[PDB]
Amino acid sequence: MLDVGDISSFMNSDSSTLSKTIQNSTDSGRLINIRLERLSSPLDDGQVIAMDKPDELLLTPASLLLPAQASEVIRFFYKGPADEKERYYRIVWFDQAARIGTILVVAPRQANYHFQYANGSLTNTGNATLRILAYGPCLKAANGKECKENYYLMPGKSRRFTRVDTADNKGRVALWQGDKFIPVK
């Protein structure tokens, strides 16, 4: 396949622009087209919805010839409202030596980051998605000597960790509020 970088990218509230590097690691050059769709949500039961205006989210370049064993920067620009709402977009990449879909999250310009860790459950009690993670011993020793989990936690949703043993005092929880890393436990 083609290397697009992160499968979900985050434009945090102090930022309206973002770059992704794409690498073509094969002998062939490639004809890439790139397209954007807003989404009701980033989840599987989400659906494409309309941008309020066609300059809400723009990228360059939308077409390029990427030669063999070479990389290029694609830039993304947000010009929609600066409000308390988080927005979700799909980046659709067409590849010719494959149609791959990745996620862009525009965190609310008016961010209110909050969370609760109670009874082993993380709950997002703010208005912007959190990137949550645990690391430490495994719950089922069938899974091995070290365990980690990584998830996106949308506003209002909860998550228990199911691989890492967070009840053991060597099990750790932390999360990202935009660009700030917060040691939860």
Residue numbers in the entry: 0 to 96, 115 to 202
Please share excerpts from the published article on this structure.
The major class of these adhesive pili (or fimbriae) is assembled via the classical, alternative and archaic chaperone-usher (CU) pathways. The biogenesis of CU fibres requires a periplasmic chaperone and outer membrane assembly platform termed the usher.
ECP is composed of the EcpA and EcpD subunits, which are assembled using two periplasmic chaperones, EcpB and EcpE, and the EcpC usher. We next crystallized free EcpB and determined its structure using I-SIRAS phasing to 2.4 Å resolution. EcpB consists of the two characteristic Ig-like domains as seen in all other chaperones and has an overall boomerang-like shape. As expected, the superposition revealed that EcpB is structurally more related to CsuC (Z-score = 14.2) than classical chaperones (e.g. Caf1M, Z-score = 12.0). Whereas the β-sheet packing in D2 in subunit-bound CsuC is almost orthogonal, in EcpB, the two β-sheets pack nearly parallel to each other, at an angle of just 15–30°. Domain 2 of EcpB does not possess helix 1, common in classical chaperones, or helices 1 and 2, characteristic for archaic chaperones. Instead, it has a short helix located in a long loop between β-strands C2 and D2. The C2-D2 loop is flanked with a pair of conserved cysteines (170 and 179), which form a disulphide bond that is not seen in classical chaperones.
